[PDB]
Design a protein around this nucleic acid. Sequence first.
RNA 1: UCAACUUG
Lengths: 115, 67, 87, 576, 8, 44, 479, 82, 98, 49, 45, 257, 93
Amino acid sequence: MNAPPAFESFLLFEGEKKITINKDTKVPNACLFTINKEDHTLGNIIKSQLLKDPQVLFAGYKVPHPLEHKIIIRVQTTPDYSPQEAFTNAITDLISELSLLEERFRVAIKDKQEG
Amino acid sequence: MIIPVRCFTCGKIVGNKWEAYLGLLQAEYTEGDALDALGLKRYCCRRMLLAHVDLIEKLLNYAPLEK
Amino acid sequence: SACPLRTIKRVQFGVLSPDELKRMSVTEGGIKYPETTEGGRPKLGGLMDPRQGVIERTGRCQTCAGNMTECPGHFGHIELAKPVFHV
Amino acid sequence: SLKQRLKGKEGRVRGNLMGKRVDFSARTVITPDPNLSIDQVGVPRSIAANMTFAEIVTPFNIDRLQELVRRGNSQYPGAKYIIRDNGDRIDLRFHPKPSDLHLQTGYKVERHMCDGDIVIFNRQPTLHKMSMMGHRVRILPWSTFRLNLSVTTPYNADFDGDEMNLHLPQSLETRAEIQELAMVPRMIVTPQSNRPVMGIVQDTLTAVRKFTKRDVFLERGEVMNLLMFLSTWDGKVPQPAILKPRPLWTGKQIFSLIIPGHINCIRTHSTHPDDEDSGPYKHISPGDTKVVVENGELIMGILCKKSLGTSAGSLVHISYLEMGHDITRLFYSNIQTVINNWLLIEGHTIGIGDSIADSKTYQDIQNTIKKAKQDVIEVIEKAHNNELEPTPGNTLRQTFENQVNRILNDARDKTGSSAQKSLSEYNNFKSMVVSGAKGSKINISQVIAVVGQQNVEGKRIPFGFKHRTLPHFIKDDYGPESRGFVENSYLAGLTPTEFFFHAMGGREGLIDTAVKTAETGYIQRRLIKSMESVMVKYDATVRNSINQVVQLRYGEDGLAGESVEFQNLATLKPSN
Amino acid sequence: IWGIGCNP
Amino acid sequence: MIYICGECHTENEIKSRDPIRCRECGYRIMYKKRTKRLVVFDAR
Amino acid sequence: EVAYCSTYTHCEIHPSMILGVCASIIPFPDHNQSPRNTYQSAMGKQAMGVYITNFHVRMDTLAHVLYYPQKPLVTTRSMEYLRFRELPAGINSIVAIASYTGYNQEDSVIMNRSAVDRGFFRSVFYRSYKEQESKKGFDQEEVFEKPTRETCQGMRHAIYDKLDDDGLIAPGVRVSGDDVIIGKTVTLPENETKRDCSTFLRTSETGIVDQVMVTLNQEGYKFCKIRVRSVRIPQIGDKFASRHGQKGTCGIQYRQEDMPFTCEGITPDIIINPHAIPSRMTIGHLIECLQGKVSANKGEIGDATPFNDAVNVQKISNLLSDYGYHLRGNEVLYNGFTGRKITSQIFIGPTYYQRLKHMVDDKIHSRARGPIQILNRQPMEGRSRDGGLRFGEMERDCQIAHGAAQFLRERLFEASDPYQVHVCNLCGIMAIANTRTHTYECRGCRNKTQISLVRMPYACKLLFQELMSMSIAPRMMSV
Amino acid sequence: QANQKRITTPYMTKYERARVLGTRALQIAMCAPVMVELEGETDPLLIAMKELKARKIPIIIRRYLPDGSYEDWGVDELIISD
Amino acid sequence: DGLKYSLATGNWGDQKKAHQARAGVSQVLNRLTFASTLSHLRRLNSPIGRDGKLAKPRQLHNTLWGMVCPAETPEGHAVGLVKNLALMAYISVGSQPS
Amino acid sequence: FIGKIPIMLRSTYCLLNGLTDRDLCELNECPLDPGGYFIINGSEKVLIA
Amino acid sequence: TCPNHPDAILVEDYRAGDMICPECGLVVGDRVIDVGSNPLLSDGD
Amino acid sequence: PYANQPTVRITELTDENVKFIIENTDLAVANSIRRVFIAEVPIIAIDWVQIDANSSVLHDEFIAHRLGLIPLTSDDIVDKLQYSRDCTCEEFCPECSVEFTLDVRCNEDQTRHVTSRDLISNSPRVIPVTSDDILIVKLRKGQELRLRAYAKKGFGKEHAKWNPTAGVAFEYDPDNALRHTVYPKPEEWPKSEYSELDEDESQAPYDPNGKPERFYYNVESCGSLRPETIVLSALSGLKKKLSDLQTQLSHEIQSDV
Amino acid sequence: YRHLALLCDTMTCRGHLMAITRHGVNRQDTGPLMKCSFEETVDVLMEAAAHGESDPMKGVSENIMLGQLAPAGTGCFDLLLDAEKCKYGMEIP
RNA sequence: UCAACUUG
Ligand SMILES: CO[C@@H]1[C@H](O)[C@H](n2cnc3c(=O)nc(N)[nH]c32)O[C@H]1COP(=O)(O)OP(=O)(O)OP(=O)(O)O
Ligand SMILES: [Mg+2]
Ligand SMILES: [Zn+2]
Ligand SMILES: [Zn+2]
Ligand SMILES: [Zn+2]
Ligand SMILES: [Zn+2]
Ligand SMILES: [Zn+2]
Ligand SMILES: [Zn+2]
């Protein structure tokens, strides 16, 4: 009777922002990103790619509550680098990785069939 | 009451296999051999066919409410 | 409503005087009729007295315009022919 | 009769005056929620929508209340009613004129319960003061009240169908009373035993033991994730304990960040060897016991029930005594969150592999039972020859039962000790018993080695049939099996006669529970009624309603029970 | 269920 | 206002304040027929 | 053998026959603690399953039938005579004894939401409402018809559109809470037209009408039974219990992606806390998981008769070792969120789990300014009557201990039964007071000037009046 | 009693703090003037807490000694238990 | 009417006289599950009062071996006062002694 | 005629006695139903020993 | 009997037990449902 | 600071199974791909059922549930179809849905098995994986079931009816070498099918420098999509999710500055 | 020790051992309503009425029954408004 | 109003 509708998990209700960027006052060059209507899928990839970056000092993702649908990602970068820049570059790198993976999987499919 | 579509744990379609399982049992296959022949490999899928109780035949015994 | 609001600072317990019971009861002459219904519904001098309390959730008792909420009810008295020990 | 109405329970005197059914109260099943803080409770949306707290319209809040009025009852953050200055109530559900919706100072909008509304949470029976605590409200999208797991210990509630009652204060004055007297963080320490009521429990205790071992080393990314769930983090990553070859933090290093402020505490782990303190390696403990916290940093030690549980001198108790109630609330919540997110990496389980022991241990248990049965037989043969001499103050039957019970109990304990020796470090039964989260050494012993003697009414299983316990046994059999001794363990499986005797023992347990509930309820009520009006006056004398002086100072020293702590005088014992 | 000194 | 009959499964129209007896069988246990309005069922 | 008795006169047919009907469904009863077998005996009575094969014909109140009952994978031989195979109550579930997210702590249970979507532990709840057209009254006739607001002086604002001409809602029509299942009208004697007498759905039923029947009852009056059907997908409050006395609610529901997964891809349908097992000492649960794994792989229903001596944990473990799994039943699990192997290996195996009748939807109640009782003018009692929860005497003692005098006052006076009375100053007895007339007078004193307003609970006014009827005078004097 | 010879505790009791904060907040909700400048605080209870910190709450607590006399301690005079 | 009333009400006696009537007989059959139906049919009810907390009539007795289920008893205020027959137990119908 | 005696279901004097399972199905009664209960005033009542 | 609405039919309510003017929503009568509470055989006895 | 370049080898490719090995990839990406297989690959399945007549023993909502779980062939049309929310038309149209109709009555004495073959689709591409058959319900003589149903595009995050896969097998480090799982007794544990060790050695020697890589997959399909297409669509969908994040992030970054 | 000593002091305050029962508790010279709440009820009320006893209304239970604020904590004191301080300070609204 | 049956 109080059960949330299934589509609420991935559909942004009107007036909700997919990403909100709020700086962190405690430490310099640190930003706290909030992603709405997303789950561990996106968060883990973004955190891993951020950790691979040498200029990223801190990178972690947190789901504040499993019943609610939100990811909080904290990125702290060295001076001369911006947390927002690190987030964008992480997303570009992940997209490149997935595209290369798609090409190679298509080639493997074509080779396995009739070969 | 009736064989469930889509074994709960994984989701393989197991609803098309109940009559084949009964027929294989009539063919004197052991239950394990019948489950192997049907393609059910993980114990989650074999649970569905092995533990199913087909009550819908007992329900069909009763005459219809409207003819 | 005009009466000032006060909080009880002492409760005095005592046996009710028969004279005080006679004066206090709204019913006069006692409950003369065992039956609760006269004129169809209300029996004056009966168990269900309009003056004693509000009835039917819409009526008003004779003594005050209770409307089933304001009226706290009002006591009645039965004058026993011969005295009886209180248990 | 009038006397019948007043006299009995549920009469006007007690059932309708001392206690009565109340409005603005809700009840539903309780389920766990580790993510909620100690003070927060998760309320379903429907329960929140029905219950309304009236808000007076002020110039400050007229806009917000106007939006709530516009939303109406249908939209969740809405207002069910508007109460005008005249006292007229405009139910917004049935159509109100647009003129009526307009608000002015002095109107009272009855808004739906929202996040942050203070409520009182209760679970019957309300044995003690901690059973009614004020919780902040957090609305979550399912139909069960959700409370944090640490708060379960004060309520004596587990989530196996339990239910709790939710009372919403309806005025700012009573809301402030709850906020400043009965909130959960304020009642961490009970005045009854000057100990903390609430402690880390279940998965978090079991996992804090494993997290705080010397062995645990955390790599960079795992440290990131654990620090992400720490609410009070300064934002500075601690320098890793092992910088090279690969940067690796330690469990204690991260737990030190959880510890509030600068708290100094020395406690001992459950498995602390007694000889360690006297011998060398007293400070460099070989087993990593002797928890020591200096400057709010965990220098050494393995945390357990003793350090983080509900006992005097615990880390949580020292936190409440020293840092304050708010920082202690954050401490409880942070321990739970960080350790529970580490438990995803480490994990816990209970399997048959834990119950099974080495073959040598099974042989030793069997040999102990063999020689015990022989000893009981020798005692029986002595008794039959009348060689047995009566113990002073006891009949020969009583002294025979005493000696037989002593032999059987010694065998039972020895088999239990052998089983407990067999347990490896990885054994999960041992993890839970050592951490103190659940179980006991007795349970391990019964699982692995021997269930033990079954006793009913303080004796071995009696002769229900004529001179024999069951029809299968021979008449006048006082031997071990006949009178109830269950040689097999739970894993091995009880033989049928042992199954019946075990059922008899368990039935005695159930009956005792059922009886104790009622008798204790009566005692508690009588004590409260006798001492209900006694209080500390402004003279600080303790006086009843009659103003008779029960005590000239409370406790004879005029101090409250929660502030006091156990201490040693140190002038008393030493010689001149 | 343990012993005479323990629990039933 | 069409009632299916339990015994013989034959629909019989019954007016208001009319005895509940099925013609052709006499049984007194009638069932109201399924409504004409249709309900959307989510497969979920 | 070594001589114990050489004069046996009778022999037991089988020791497992000492157990009753409900205790016979427990697998490996001898490996459990005794109170846990006792508790399972009680929980089995409350499980959900096809109670009888003629349930479609029957119109019973509170009938629950599970969608997909399954017979146990580990079954006692004596279950066959109880017909448990024919009419099972529960579903074999892949159960992992692990601590995953802390939502399975205490006795709660983490359930797989994808499995729930695929029909796992889904049930139907049928409720039957009976109404009788009674003409016994001298001038009162409770005719079945659709009440009309204009025609009927007594009426209610709930939805009356559902009712057909006969006053009975047709089968196949959705009924939400506070809707009129049956419409009945009592003709009103014109003492000098209609007091509504419809029956209304229990709040939050939210079901679809299944069958509507019209007959003549024993008395000969027209009798109508209406059965409403509500599907019940498991939620995060419902109570699930195994056959070994382990009962618990559903802490949270994670989708198949989120649940931990073996290397084969099997994700536990139910995750139970490891902390339940040791204190309760229900080792029968663990042995049933092992035997269920062996049975599902082998294809033969396992035997769990209480006293066998041919089935040991070691033999079961060796059998499982043959089928490619760890001999003790542990399996290497991977974390669903991150993909990393869980360091400890989790014990996963199929176990017969039951669904009990207790569900959160039936047990949720909220009260705020509802109807009050007639006698005490206090809130009603019970979920059906929208009754408020009782603030017992133990609760008031706790509040006294807190020192929250004003919360105690609100809860015991202002929330429950606020009331005002007028009391004479000269004599403590209450005085007659006409607010509309604005004349306040006290009988027995002939005094009008000295009257004071007093705020007291209505129950206290009733107490004082009952004392007055016993000739005791509770003279409440403000001075 | 006289202002001199006050025997009660200088520290404000927990119950006094609860009732003073609640009562002052109820007054603030009824549009009573607020002594302390509010930094965008709309909730009446929070404003009352700020006032209590500043010791500007306009309430004098009357403590009833068991002998029947009373001592009037203003909220400012009492030391906050915090 | 006498037989029907005594069955329906659950009071064993006459309508006018309830002083000697024994309540608790003739309960409604539980149909939650087939196991509940069967157990309800095979049930024994000890006459000892529930209100009395004396523990002797509640404890499992050695003579209940094979006649009454050891495990199956209600937990609460009626522990050991309501019992269920074992599977093989058969209560004697009765015979003439001639 | 001296009155009516309620009949326990599936006893010797009930209609269901000695009926094949198919016939029980024809009467819309379950073959697996245990019997042993009285149907008084439309509700199944069980006499607890 | 809504004071601002001469001859106004007040709709009954079950949630709070009151009659409410439908065009303005005013609650006329606060808690005036409460519970709201054989004549054939013989007569008054 | 750049993405690793992954590789793929497909060991087995059948009609219902794909086994592949992803190498030179992080654990997070591999587990996310596994997750997207289960919950974010779009498929067409029945979500709307209007039942005209149901004389079967199973009630109406039972039939609707069983119908929803029936897999429907969505190999190529699922990309063309739009989500019902996206489509401009009210309720359902051929662009946003596929209409299935079922009419069966049992007039023979023998029991009639209503199967998925009796479901009839207006669109040829979407068929209930028939080209035995899934048993919807069994009908006695005189019992009739007639219903009309529409099928919508969606993914498994909404409901398990849209879950393309049967079981996704994910395994890394087959011989425990990073010691991610610490076996109490190494010898008892069965060796992995992908394990490269000899029978004598239970675990590989610990490698501190090593990190998880060379992830092993085994994706099985319900027949709704080709097993190859499940993997390709999952990779494409995860790429789309990241690109949408990048667009919204660029908007927020520009707006703040 | 405070909680034990308080029970012992209440039982032995009067000089005669006061059992925590209806007899011992009700015999002490408390208010008649407070005695009424514990066990005896109606009989206590009848005796009080006969002897003309007056309830001091200083007890917690007596004030709870009549709906007045209890003399317990948060009710021991009475707050008063401070006019002079109201005049002082910045009266923003 | 009474009874019984459960839930802690
Ligand atoms: C732990 O104590 C609680 C409380 O004291 C409260 N309670 C319960 N029944 C009563 C009652 O009749 N009367 C009163 N006054 N209180 C009562 O319930 C007690 C325990 O009972 P249990 O022992 O069955 O709890 P499991 O150990 O059984 O918990 P599993 O593993 O099922 O979740
Ligand atoms: Mg519990
Ligand atoms: Zn499967
Ligand atoms: Zn009046
Ligand atoms: Zn007919
Ligand atoms: Zn007077
Ligand atoms: Zn109006
Ligand atoms: Zn369209």
